[PDB]
Design an enzyme around this catalytic site. Structure first.
Site, PDB file in Angstrom:
ATOM      1  N   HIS A 162       0.633  -1.000  -0.021  1.00  0.00           N
ATOM      2  CA  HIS A 162      -0.181  -0.438   0.425  1.00  0.00           C
ATOM      3  C   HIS A 162       1.060   0.996   0.019  1.00  0.00           C
ATOM      4  CE1 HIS A 162      -3.952  -1.624  -0.029  1.00  0.00           C
ATOM      5  NE2 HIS A 162      -3.472  -2.538   1.479  1.00  0.00           N
ATOM      6  N   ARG A 176      30.065  15.671  -8.237  1.00  0.00           N
ATOM      7  CA  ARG A 176      30.437  14.359  -7.714  1.00  0.00           C
ATOM      8  C   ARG A 176      29.347  13.997  -6.139  1.00  0.00           C
ATOM      9  NH1 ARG A 176      35.441  13.403 -10.798  1.00  0.00           N
ATOM     10  NH2 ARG A 176      36.245  14.879  -9.114  1.00  0.00           N
ATOM     11  N   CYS A 221      17.812   3.452   8.679  1.00  0.00           N
ATOM     12  CA  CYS A 221      18.443   2.280   8.952  1.00  0.00           C
ATOM     13  C   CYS A 221      18.639   2.214   7.287  1.00  0.00           C
ATOM     14  CB  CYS A 221      17.202   1.541   8.557  1.00  0.00           C
ATOM     15  SG  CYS A 221      16.708   0.402   9.776  1.00  0.00           S
ATOM     16  N   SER A 253      20.757  -2.219   7.584  1.00  0.00           N
ATOM     17  CA  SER A 253      20.058  -2.859   8.468  1.00  0.00           C
ATOM     18  C   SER A 253      18.490  -2.826   6.516  1.00  0.00           C
ATOM     19  CB  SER A 253      19.474  -2.464   9.448  1.00  0.00           C
ATOM     20  OG  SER A 253      18.713  -3.661  10.236  1.00  0.00           O
ATOM     21  N   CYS A 254      18.291  -4.693   6.323  1.00  0.00           N
ATOM     22  CA  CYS A 254      17.359  -4.693   5.775  1.00  0.00           C
ATOM     23  C   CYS A 254      16.807  -5.735   5.941  1.00  0.00           C
ATOM     24  CB  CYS A 254      18.016  -4.679   4.811  1.00  0.00           C
ATOM     25  SG  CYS A 254      16.846  -4.906   3.037  1.00  0.00           S
ATOM     26  N   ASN A 303      10.969   0.381   0.943  1.00  0.00           N
ATOM     27  CA  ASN A 303      11.681   1.100   1.248  1.00  0.00           C
ATOM     28  C   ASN A 303      12.707   1.645  -0.429  1.00  0.00           C
ATOM     29  OD1 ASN A 303      12.402   0.988   3.893  1.00  0.00           O
ATOM     30  ND2 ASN A 303      12.966  -1.072   3.319  1.00  0.00           N
ATOM     31  N   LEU A 337      16.344 -11.773   6.739  1.00  0.00           N
ATOM     32  CA  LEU A 337      15.040 -12.324   6.450  1.00  0.00           C
ATOM     33  C   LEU A 337      14.344 -12.483   7.778  1.00  0.00           C
ATOM     34  CD1 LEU A 337      14.602 -14.912   3.574  1.00  0.00           C
ATOM     35  CD2 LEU A 337      12.814 -12.757   3.849  1.00  0.00           C
ATOM     36  N   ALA A 373       8.901  -7.994  13.347  1.00  0.00           N
ATOM     37  CA  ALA A 373       9.903  -7.574  15.271  1.00  0.00           C
ATOM     38  C   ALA A 373      10.168  -6.924  14.947  1.00  0.00           C
ATOM     39  CB  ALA A 373      10.537  -8.956  14.620  1.00  0.00           C
TER      40      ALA A 373
HETATM   41  C1  LIG Z   1      11.158   0.227   6.063  1.00  0.00           C
HETATM   42  C2  LIG Z   1      10.299   0.815   6.454  1.00  0.00           C
HETATM   43  C3  LIG Z   1       9.556   1.293   6.852  1.00  0.00           C
HETATM   44  N1  LIG Z   1       9.046   0.717   8.225  1.00  0.00           N
HETATM   45  C4  LIG Z   1      10.119   0.475   9.449  1.00  0.00           C
HETATM   46  C5  LIG Z   1       9.858  -0.848   9.939  1.00  0.00           C
HETATM   47  C6  LIG Z   1      10.484  -0.773  11.180  1.00  0.00           C
HETATM   48  C7  LIG Z   1      10.653  -2.225  11.790  1.00  0.00           C
HETATM   49  C8  LIG Z   1      11.035  -3.300  11.513  1.00  0.00           C
HETATM   50  N2  LIG Z   1      11.049  -4.776  11.522  1.00  0.00           N
HETATM   51  C9  LIG Z   1      10.647  -5.579  11.161  1.00  0.00           C
HETATM   52  N3  LIG Z   1      10.752  -6.645  11.955  1.00  0.00           N
HETATM   53  N4  LIG Z   1      10.756  -5.717   9.955  1.00  0.00           N
HETATM   54  C10 LIG Z   1      10.385  -4.370   9.419  1.00  0.00           C
HETATM   55  O1  LIG Z   1      10.538  -4.162   7.841  1.00  0.00           O
HETATM   56  C11 LIG Z   1      10.561  -3.591   9.627  1.00  0.00           C
HETATM   57  C12 LIG Z   1      10.247  -1.918   9.063  1.00  0.00           C
HETATM   58  C13 LIG Z   1       7.913  -0.670   7.706  1.00  0.00           C
HETATM   59  C14 LIG Z   1       6.707  -0.257   9.015  1.00  0.00           C
HETATM   60  C15 LIG Z   1       5.559  -1.197   9.353  1.00  0.00           C
HETATM   61  C16 LIG Z   1       5.476  -2.232   8.081  1.00  0.00           C
HETATM   62  C17 LIG Z   1       4.208  -3.106   7.761  1.00  0.00           C
HETATM   63  O2  LIG Z   1       4.258  -3.898   9.252  1.00  0.00           O
HETATM   64  N5  LIG Z   1       3.725  -3.297   6.677  1.00  0.00           N
HETATM   65  C18 LIG Z   1       1.786  -3.483   7.001  1.00  0.00           C
HETATM   66  C19 LIG Z   1       1.610  -1.820   6.902  1.00  0.00           C
HETATM   67  C20 LIG Z   1       2.401  -0.995   5.057  1.00  0.00           C
HETATM   68  C21 LIG Z   1       1.418   0.413   5.152  1.00  0.00           C
HETATM   69  O3  LIG Z   1       0.926   0.657   6.476  1.00  0.00           O
HETATM   70  O4  LIG Z   1       1.766   0.608   4.322  1.00  0.00           O
HETATM   71  C22 LIG Z   1       1.694  -4.384   6.116  1.00  0.00           C
HETATM   72  O5  LIG Z   1       0.268  -4.602   6.439  1.00  0.00           O
HETATM   73  O6  LIG Z   1       2.622  -3.946   4.913  1.00  0.00           O
HETATM   74  C23 LIG Z   1       6.062  -2.218   7.109  1.00  0.00           C
HETATM   75  C24 LIG Z   1       7.232  -0.979   6.516  1.00  0.00           C
HETATM   76  C1  LIG Z   2      38.970  10.822  -3.371  1.00  0.00           C
HETATM   77  C2  LIG Z   2      40.218  10.897  -2.028  1.00  0.00           C
HETATM   78  C3  LIG Z   2      40.097   8.882  -2.234  1.00  0.00           C
HETATM   79  O1  LIG Z   2      40.488   8.459  -0.990  1.00  0.00           O
HETATM   80  N1  LIG Z   2      40.012   7.503  -3.143  1.00  0.00           N
HETATM   81  C4  LIG Z   2      39.375   8.376  -4.219  1.00  0.00           C
HETATM   82  O2  LIG Z   2      39.658   7.770  -5.471  1.00  0.00           O
HETATM   83  N2  LIG Z   2      38.968  10.009  -4.543  1.00  0.00           N
HETATM   84  C5  LIG Z   2      38.940  10.418  -6.094  1.00  0.00           C
HETATM   85  C6  LIG Z   2      37.415  10.321  -5.980  1.00  0.00           C
HETATM   86  C7  LIG Z   2      37.536  11.604  -7.210  1.00  0.00           C
HETATM   87  O3  LIG Z   2      38.681  11.428  -8.406  1.00  0.00           O
HETATM   88  C8  LIG Z   2      38.752  12.735  -6.516  1.00  0.00           C
HETATM   89  C9  LIG Z   2      37.872  13.564  -6.082  1.00  0.00           C
HETATM   90  O4  LIG Z   2      37.055  14.513  -6.387  1.00  0.00           O
HETATM   91  P1  LIG Z   2      35.531  15.793  -6.245  1.00  0.00           P
HETATM   92  O5  LIG Z   2      35.563  15.393  -4.226  1.00  0.00           O
HETATM   93  O6  LIG Z   2      34.788  13.713  -6.373  1.00  0.00           O
HETATM   94  O7  LIG Z   2      34.561  16.709  -6.463  1.00  0.00           O
HETATM   95  O8  LIG Z   2      39.168  12.394  -6.518  1.00  0.00           O
HETATM   96  O1  LIG Z   3      13.050   1.885   6.341  1.00  0.00           O
HETATM   97  C1  LIG Z   3      13.045   0.232   7.821  1.00  0.00           C
HETATM   98  C2  LIG Z   3      13.505   0.470   9.198  1.00  0.00           C
HETATM   99  C3  LIG Z   3      13.788  -1.038   9.449  1.00  0.00           C
HETATM  100  N1  LIG Z   3      13.994  -1.572   8.815  1.00  0.00           N
HETATM  101  C4  LIG Z   3      14.225  -2.768   9.541  1.00  0.00           C
HETATM  102  C5  LIG Z   3      15.614  -3.589   9.367  1.00  0.00           C
HETATM  103  C6  LIG Z   3      15.614  -4.329  10.971  1.00  0.00           C
HETATM  104  O2  LIG Z   3      15.270  -5.755  10.614  1.00  0.00           O
HETATM  105  C7  LIG Z   3      15.020  -3.895  11.860  1.00  0.00           C
HETATM  106  C8  LIG Z   3      16.055  -2.599  12.534  1.00  0.00           C
HETATM  107  O3  LIG Z   3      17.046  -3.421  12.890  1.00  0.00           O
HETATM  108  P1  LIG Z   3      18.821  -3.003  13.838  1.00  0.00           P
HETATM  109  O4  LIG Z   3      19.191  -2.672  12.531  1.00  0.00           O
HETATM  110  O5  LIG Z   3      18.341  -1.435  14.738  1.00  0.00           O
HETATM  111  O6  LIG Z   3      18.828  -3.940  14.544  1.00  0.00           O
HETATM  112  O7  LIG Z   3      14.020  -2.668  10.864  1.00  0.00           O
HETATM  113  C9  LIG Z   3      14.447  -1.708   7.369  1.00  0.00           C
HETATM  114  O8  LIG Z   3      14.330  -2.629   6.890  1.00  0.00           O
HETATM  115  N2  LIG Z   3      13.459  -0.460   7.208  1.00  0.00           N
END
Ligand SMILES: C#CCN(Cc1ccc2[nH]c(N)nc(=O)c2c1)c1ccc(C(=O)N[C@@H](CCC(=O)O)C(=O)O)cc1
Ligand SMILES: *c1cc(=O)[nH]c(=O)n1[C@H]1C[C@H](O)[C@@H](COP(=O)(O)O)O1
Ligand SMILES: O=c1ccn([C@H]2C[C@H](O)[C@@H](COP(=O)(O)O)O2)c(=O)[nH]1
Ligand SMILES: C#CCN(Cc1ccc2[nH]c(N)nc(=O)c2c1)c1ccc(C(=O)N[C@@H](CCC(=O)O)C(=O)O)cc1
Lengths: 264, 264
Positions: free
Chosen positions: A51, A126, A146, A167-168, A177, A208, A263
């Site tokens: 959604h 850049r 995150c 973290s994902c 996201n 997962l 969770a």
């Molecule tokens: C990423 C991100 C942001 N977030 C934050 C966020 C925070 C802690 C998390 N913790 C865990 N275990 N998994 C997650 O993917 C997670 C995501 C979200 C918050 C709620 C839902 C959720 O439960 N989904 C419902 C509601 C969806 C909606 O309201 O649109 C669903 O039914 O899908 C999904 C993403």
């Molecule tokens: C920056 C510093 C480093 O440790 N390693 C790198 O490869 N660089 C490079 C990236 C780019 O060629 C130039 C930086 O230019 P700008 O900041 O991107 O504008 O150095």
């Molecule tokens: O936008 C978000 C917010 C949270 N999380 C997830 C990552 C982890 O599963 C948990 C956050 O836990 P920590 O990384 O802080 O442990 O919620 C996402 O995947 N996307």
């Protein structure tokens, strides 16, 4: 979608059994990347109904720099209630950092405004980045970001973006996201007169949860379907003036939703 | 190395031309990921002779929290000269953010010590991160950070690391960065009695400069040789107590060096 379903299969086949801070358990892999050509359609998962209502209000919420769950509740969006304090504050999380990053000397940096101006004035830069990983304020946040870091990139009149997710939760959060950021890219592209490019997702700990095994297996049975197309029905004066109605997803014909435990 | 060379080939095959602020042209792709199993050997480029001396000294300099080149000069390392001011100062770059990221409260956070403690007491954490991307102090830095953010991960008693480099000069800087972080991982691992795992490299704007094309193809025509081996002859009391002499690289037989211009 193909990429997403492969990540799921990958976690199952290569994941490692870790015990997380929840105690629930987890299959995990470290380091992964997927590319989404936005020209092929909006990357909203079809093997399960998602959604957009909550995804959109949260993003618009983020752009406001608001960190109070108020606006979200006023739009019947829960998501962040399980971490908000009495008043509905979450600390200087995404949004506060996006619009008002605190300097050590009291000032505030507007990363979204900076990014807009760089996109329009120095597209080749850049260092077009927005960072939510504000070390100095991590302890004041209801939770650590995150999706913590993202970078824009322009090439042939196309706007691309890479997100770094430390973290994902593959099953519940990823679909959310991905769509969230794909959304932002379109909004930025429209505000800067650029075609959309690639959305590159990069993750750290990709997992997962144990009590998601059934759902995942169920989802891996379903065949992906054509991706929908996002429609923006109005060009606001600024990237901060978008309203919920302005968006419409067309062609979204997903498999039925799948309920799963979150969770916390 | 296979991974490195395939990267170059990819930039050349799929890169688009872009102009950077240096007025120099580039060939670039956006978003890429590379994996190195550190147990296979130390990831130091063999198709071109690399200079470890400088790589090691810069790293020790970072761990010390130092941002002035005086130390690098004492050990005759020149890599940073072009960016230092009259006093040898580079500003609040890498070393400073790593060892003392300034918060708004007036506090300072030592991210290296922090991750060490997380690695030892909560290795399963998904927040073991070090960031040099301090939005608040970018304007004080001689150069914006390139290797901007990195995350650690433990599994099977092995320490893995993922680096996100927003901008990458493939021919000149990448070999340095790979070896630098591979070294940090061995040190972190030795201090935490962990075995080394994977070093995952993730790049944003990855490019080759127009004046590096010939050298790039020259190197590209060579066959990689077996990876060298890293040998640490001591276990210091702390991560901050390593000396240059504690390191030994054995079995390093590289192809001839290839001199190339640096864009400033
Ligand atoms: C990423 C991100 C942001 N977030 C934050 C966020 C925070 C802690 C998390 N913790 C865990 N275990 N998994 C997650 O993917 C997670 C995501 C979200 C918050 C709620 C839902 C959720 O439960 N989904 C419902 C509601 C969806 C909606 O309201 O649109 C669903 O039914 O899908 C999904 C993403
Ligand atoms: C920056 C510093 C480093 O440790 N390693 C790198 O490869 N660089 C490079 C990236 C780019 O060629 C130039 C930086 O230019 P700008 O900041 O991107 O504008 O150095
Ligand atoms: O936008 C978000 C917010 C949270 N999380 C997830 C990552 C982890 O599963 C948990 C956050 O836990 P920590 O990384 O802080 O442990 O919620 C996402 O995947 N996307
Ligand atoms: C990464 C990083 C740190 N750095 C910093 C750093 C800062 C700005 C940059 N800018 C550009 N355009 N490219 C870079 O790779 C780069 C690197 C380095 C600086 C110089 C060399 C260099 O001249 N390469 C020679 C070094 C010879 C020597 O050892 O003295 C080589 O051929 O190896 C390498 C690393």
């Amino acid at each position: 979608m193909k990429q997403y379903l492969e990540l799921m299969q990958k976690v199952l086949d290569e994941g490692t059994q870790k015990n997380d801070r929840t105690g629930t358990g987890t299959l995990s892999i470290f380091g992964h990347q997927m590319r989404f050509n936005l020209q092929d359609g909006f990357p909203l998962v079809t093997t399960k109904r998602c959604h957009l209502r909550s995804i959109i209000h949260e993003l618009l919420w983020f752009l406001q720099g608001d960190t109070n769950i108020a606006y979200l509740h006023e739009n019947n969006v829960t998501i962040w209630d399980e971490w908000a304090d009495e008043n509905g504050d979450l600390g200087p999380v995404y949004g506060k950092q996006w619009r008002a990053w605190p300097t050590p000397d009291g000032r505030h940096i507007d990363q979204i405004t900076t990014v807009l101006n760089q996109l329009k004035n120095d597209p080749d830069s850049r260092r077009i980045i927005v960072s939510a990983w504000n070390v100095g304020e991590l302890d004041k946040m209801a939770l650590a970001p995150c999706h913590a870091f993202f970078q824009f990139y322009v090439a042939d009149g196309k706007l691309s973006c890479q997100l770094y997710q430390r973290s994902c939760c593959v099953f519940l959060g990823l679909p959310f996201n991905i769509a969230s950021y794909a959304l932002l890219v379109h909004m930025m592209a429209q505000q800067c007169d650029l075609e959309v490019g690639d959305f590159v997702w990069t993750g750290g700990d990709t997992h997962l949860y144990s009590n998601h095994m059934d759902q995942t297996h169920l989802q891996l049975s379903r065949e992906p379907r054509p991706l929908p197309k996002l429609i923006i029905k109005r060009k606001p004066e600024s990237i901060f003036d978008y309203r919920f109605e302005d968006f419409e997803i067309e062609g979204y014909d997903p498999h039925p939703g799948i309920k799963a435990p979150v969770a916390i």
